[PDB]
Amino acid sequence: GDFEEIPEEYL
Amino acid sequence: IVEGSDAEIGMSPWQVMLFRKSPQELLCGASLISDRWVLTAAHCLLYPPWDKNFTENDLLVRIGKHSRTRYERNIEKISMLEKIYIHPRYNWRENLDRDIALMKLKKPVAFSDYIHPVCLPDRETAASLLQAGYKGRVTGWGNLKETKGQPSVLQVVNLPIVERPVCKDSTRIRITDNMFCAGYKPDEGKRGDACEGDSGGPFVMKSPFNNRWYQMGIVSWGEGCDRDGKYGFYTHVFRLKKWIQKVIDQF
Amino acid sequence: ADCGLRPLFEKKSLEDKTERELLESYI
Numbered sequence: 001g002d003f004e005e006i007p008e009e010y011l
Numbered sequence: 012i013v014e015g016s017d018a019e020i021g022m023s024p025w026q027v028m029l030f031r032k033s034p035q036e037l038l039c040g041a042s043l044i045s046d047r048w049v050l051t052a053a054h055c056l057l058y059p060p061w062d063k064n065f066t067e068n069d070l071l072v073r074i075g076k077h078s079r080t081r082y083e084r085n086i087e088k089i090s091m092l093e094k095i096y097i098h099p100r101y102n103w104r105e106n107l108d109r110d111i112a113l114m115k116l117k118k119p120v121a122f123s124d125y126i127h128p129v130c131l132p133d134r135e136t137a138a139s140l141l142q143a144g145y146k147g148r149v150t151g152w153g154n155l156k157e158t159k160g161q162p163s164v165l166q167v168v169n170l171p172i173v174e175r176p177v178c179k180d181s182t183r184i185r186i187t188d189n190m191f192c193a194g195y196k197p198d199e200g201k202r203g204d205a206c207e208g209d210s211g212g213p214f215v216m217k218s219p220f221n222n223r224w225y226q227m228g229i230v231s232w233g234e235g236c237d238r239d240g241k242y243g244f245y246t247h248v249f250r251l252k253k254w255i256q257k258v259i260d261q262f
Numbered sequence: 263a264d265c266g267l268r269p270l271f272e273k274k275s276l277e278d279k280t281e282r283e284l285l286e287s288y289i
């Protein structure tokens with residue numbers, strides 16, 4: 001929650 | 012990493028981050044052995060005592076990073092897992108023996124200036140480079156102290172391999188052979204150590220015979236970060252070679 | 263077959279700020 005947002009595509 | 016020092020860009024093109032899908036967070040370090048095979052500490056996916064039994068569809072691998080929080084775009088890559096192979100005789104009950112584990116990426120990543128695989132030792136290289144006194148290099152994003160707190164970019168600290176006897180005497184756990192301990196003696200004047208957040212981290216040594224970097228151990232367990240009289244323990248990779256090549260020369 | 267060697271170092275004959283330390287220990 002402190003890191004950066006990764007593109008959904010990967011999730 | 013404790014008392015280490017910010018790494019240089021492209022110093023560990025084999026460093027791999029074990030990111031957890033949800034909640035998104037760090038978990039363990041890892042090295043890139045092949046173009047479709049990652050190697051990390053076993054107790055990073057399986058450790059009953061803490062109800063830690065992650066499955067493939069629970070994590071994400073991230074190669075080519077240097078910054079710990081930002082999604083270093085164009086540089087890093089995120090490949091999903093296709094299967095987690097843990098050593099069938101990984102003793103998580105007694106002393107984390109044979110704490111090794113492999114991971115198969117669905118699609119093979121593409122190498123670059125910041126993404127390159129690491130060599131696994133053989134009987135020879137390991138037969139000469141694995142000696143007390145020699146120094147290895149640990150790298151990780153883990154805490155900066157046992158209790159700032161975390162680094163901003165992959166940390167790196169070189170450490171000296173410690174004799175077998177010194178390891179045992181510095182603990183109450185039964186030390187097998189699939190593990191050796193590295194670190195500085197209370198008097199050596201210099202410090203350093205792995206730490207919470209370096210699990211699976213790759214422990215390498217540059218071969219003075221062919222300028223090639225070889226991974227000897229795998230950040231496993233410790234007893235306090237940079238505590239005097241104590242040392243970190245890594246998985247003696249070479250030994251578990253037979254299990255590796257097998258898991259690979261099969262599936 | 264090409265492992266170990268680093269793109270921005272061994273492939274450009276460049277040493278990192280603290281690698282000699284390792285090498286120097288192999289007495």
Ligand SMILES: O=C(CN1C(Cl)CN=C(NCCc2ccccn2)C1O)NCc1csc2ccc(Cl)cc12
Nearest residue numbers: 054105106107205206207230231232233236243244
């Ligand atoms: O978080 C871990 C792994 N674990 C687990 Cl799951 C459980 N217990 C640990 N320590 C106590 C010794 C012990 C008990 C039972 C089995 C094996 N070792 C331990 O250590 N490692 C990260 C770490 C923190 S400080 C540190 C210093 C050096 C190295 Cl290599 C790693 C670490």
